[PDB]
Design an enzyme around this catalytic site. Structure first.
Site, PDB file in Angstrom:
ATOM      1  CG  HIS A 132     -11.259  -8.973  -2.240  1.00 19.38           C
ATOM      2  ND1 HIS A 132     -11.564  -8.052  -1.263  1.00 19.38           N
ATOM      3  CD2 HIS A 132     -10.080  -8.582  -2.761  1.00 19.38           C
ATOM      4  CE1 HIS A 132     -10.599  -7.154  -1.191  1.00 19.38           C
ATOM      5  NE2 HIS A 132      -9.683  -7.460  -2.081  1.00 19.38           N
ATOM      6  CB  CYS A 137      -7.609  -6.857  -4.929  1.00 16.97           C
ATOM      7  SG  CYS A 137      -6.539  -8.238  -4.505  1.00 16.97           S
TER       8      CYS A 137
HETATM    9  C1  LIG Z   1      -5.214  -7.459  -3.905  1.00  8.74           C
HETATM   10  O1  LIG Z   1      -5.153  -6.257  -3.609  1.00  8.74           O
HETATM   11  C2  LIG Z   1      -3.987  -8.412  -3.870  1.00  8.74           C
HETATM   12  C3  LIG Z   1      -2.698  -7.761  -4.507  1.00  8.74           C
HETATM   13  N1  LIG Z   1      -2.799  -7.449  -5.974  1.00  8.74           N
HETATM   14  C4  LIG Z   1      -1.607  -6.996  -6.249  1.00  8.74           C
HETATM   15  C5  LIG Z   1      -1.114  -7.037  -7.722  1.00  8.74           C
HETATM   16  O2  LIG Z   1      -1.856  -6.387  -8.558  1.00  8.74           O
HETATM   17  O3  LIG Z   1      -0.075  -7.763  -7.951  1.00  8.74           O
HETATM   18  C6  LIG Z   1      -0.712  -6.846  -4.990  1.00  8.74           C
HETATM   19  S1  LIG Z   1       0.958  -5.936  -5.065  1.00  8.74           S
HETATM   20  C7  LIG Z   1       2.249  -6.787  -6.093  1.00  8.74           C
HETATM   21  C8  LIG Z   1       3.256  -5.839  -6.759  1.00  8.74           C
HETATM   22  O4  LIG Z   1       4.369  -6.284  -7.072  1.00  8.74           O
HETATM   23  O5  LIG Z   1       2.800  -4.510  -6.976  1.00  8.74           O
HETATM   24  C9  LIG Z   1       3.696  -3.436  -7.403  1.00  8.74           C
HETATM   25  C10 LIG Z   1       4.246  -2.634  -6.203  1.00  8.74           C
HETATM   26  C11 LIG Z   1       5.758  -2.402  -6.168  1.00  8.74           C
HETATM   27  C12 LIG Z   1      -1.165  -8.146  -4.312  1.00  8.74           C
HETATM   28  C13 LIG Z   1      -0.678  -9.468  -4.922  1.00  8.74           C
HETATM   29  C14 LIG Z   1      -3.848  -9.241  -2.538  1.00  8.74           C
HETATM   30  C15 LIG Z   1      -4.711  -8.813  -1.332  1.00  8.74           C
HETATM   31  O6  LIG Z   1      -3.994 -10.689  -2.807  1.00  8.74           O
END
Ligand SMILES: *C(=O)[C@@H](C1=N[C@H](C(=O)O)[C@H](SCC(=O)OCCC)[C@@H]1C)[C@@H](C)O
Length: 351
Positions: free
Chosen positions: A280, A298
């Site tokens: 994004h 992300c």
């Molecule tokens: C983008 O930044 C998105 C975001 N990506 C992650 C991912 O890689 O899962 C996060 S954190 C989920 C997690 O359990 O990470 C380990 C920390 C303890 C989230 C889903 C968002 C803006 O959609």
């Protein structure tokens, strides 16, 4: 000196007759002079008699929990024969409706699996798989694998070849899918595989490189997940794409009010995992992009690169993330199918 014979596909007195197949009556040593089928209310089913007069068949869907009465008369040169048969069709405890992806008539990338999602848990996976007919041209070996109790996926060993036609006939109406549950309807989709588009995010360079049919067409400085919330390595299938979307951490289980949570509106977002990884627009990290990992996971890239990605990448294209400090994307994420070893995917999990 001969009496006409009748052969129906059902027997007088049958119960639990399944509604996945038409009902037919055939004449031998004679032709069919009258065939009517009627439901428990007197309402005619009707169907088609063959030009030669030998074979009659229902032409419409027969219903669950009905009692049908079939009357038939065959005239021969050597006399007449009449039969009346009454039978009852399946009585489901429940109905499940399947939903197929990708969309009918769509052109998708080389990593797009066929997806059949049922709106209820499927007790007999084997029966579901047997009801799903996949045709590929050029033909290619593939196999089913279940991501959860409701969704089954079908794919080859390797990424599809561009130009492959894929046809999916989910013939689940009338089929007992276990513990009293029957398909609500049949569904059908057909799609085509388009260009090969694979984007690689190498943590060693912090560049996202898009390759179309093997040539580099874009090189995107990116900022991935910070060391404490890293981007998982592995193969991601491109899903849906948004001119703008509100990213809500509650969607993915994490309270917004929580320490790792968030709610932010972002631009030009392409989804690559169900766990919520997107490519994004990230104007605030333009200076980090190419240098250091600052996101929740992300793939942050510049606004024009995100829009480029929205315009030039399609459902079923591939993003591979490599060399990060994170683990591997789950094979059962929703968009992580290709991370399951072929031997395991092929053997399946129908039992
Ligand atoms: C983008 O930044 C998105 C975001 N990506 C992650 C991912 O890689 O899962 C996060 S954190 C989920 C997690 O359990 O990470 C380990 C920390 C303890 C989230 C889903 C968002 C803006 O959609």
């Amino acid at each position: 000196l001969l009496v006409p014979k009748l052969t129906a596909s059902v027997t007088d007195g049958a119960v639990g007759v399944t509604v996945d197949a038409p009902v037919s009556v055939t004449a031998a040593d004679g032709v069919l002079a009258a065939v009517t089928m009627v439901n428990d209310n007197g309402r005619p089913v009707a169907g088609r008699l063959s030009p030669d007069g030998l074979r009659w068949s229902t032409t419409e869907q027969l219903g669950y929990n009905r009692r049908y009465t079939l009357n038939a008369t065959a005239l021969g040169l050597g006399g007449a024969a009449t039969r009346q048969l009454t039978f009852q069709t399946s009585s489901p405890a429940h109905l499940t409706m399947p939903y197929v992806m990708p969309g009918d008539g769509e052109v998708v990338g080389v990593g797009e699996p066929v997806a059949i999602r049922f709106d209820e848990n499927i007790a007999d996976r084997g029966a579901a798989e047997k009801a799903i007919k996949i045709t590929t041209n050029p033909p290619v070996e593939g196999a089913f694998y279940w991501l959860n109790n409701r969704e089954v996926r079908w794919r080859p060993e390797h990424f599809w070849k561009p130009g492959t036609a894929v046809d999916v006939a989910v013939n689940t109406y009338g089929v007992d899918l276990g513990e009293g549950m029957f398909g609500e309807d049949n569904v059908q989709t057909h799609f085509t595989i388009g260009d090969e588009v694979i984007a690689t995010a190498d943590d060693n360079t912090k560049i996202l490189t898009v390759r179309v049919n093997g040539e580099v067409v874009k090189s995107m400085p990116t900022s991935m997940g910070k060391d404490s919330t890293p981007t998982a390595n592995g193969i991601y299938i491109v899903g849906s794409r948004y001119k703008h979307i509100i990213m809500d951490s509650s969607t993915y289980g994490v309270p917004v009010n929580s320490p790792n949570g968030y709610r932010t509106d972002v631009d030009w977002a392409t989804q690559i995992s169900y766990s919520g990884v997107f490519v994004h627009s990230a104007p605030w990290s333009v200076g980090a992009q190419g240098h250091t990992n600052t996101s929740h996971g992300c793939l942050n890239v510049s606004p024009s690169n995100a829009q480029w990605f929205y315009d030039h990448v399609k459902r079923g294209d591939i993003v591979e993330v490599v060399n990060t400090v994170g683990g591997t994307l789950p094979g059962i994420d929703g968009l992580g199918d290709w991370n399951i070893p072929w031997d395991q995917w092929r053997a399946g999990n129908a039992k």
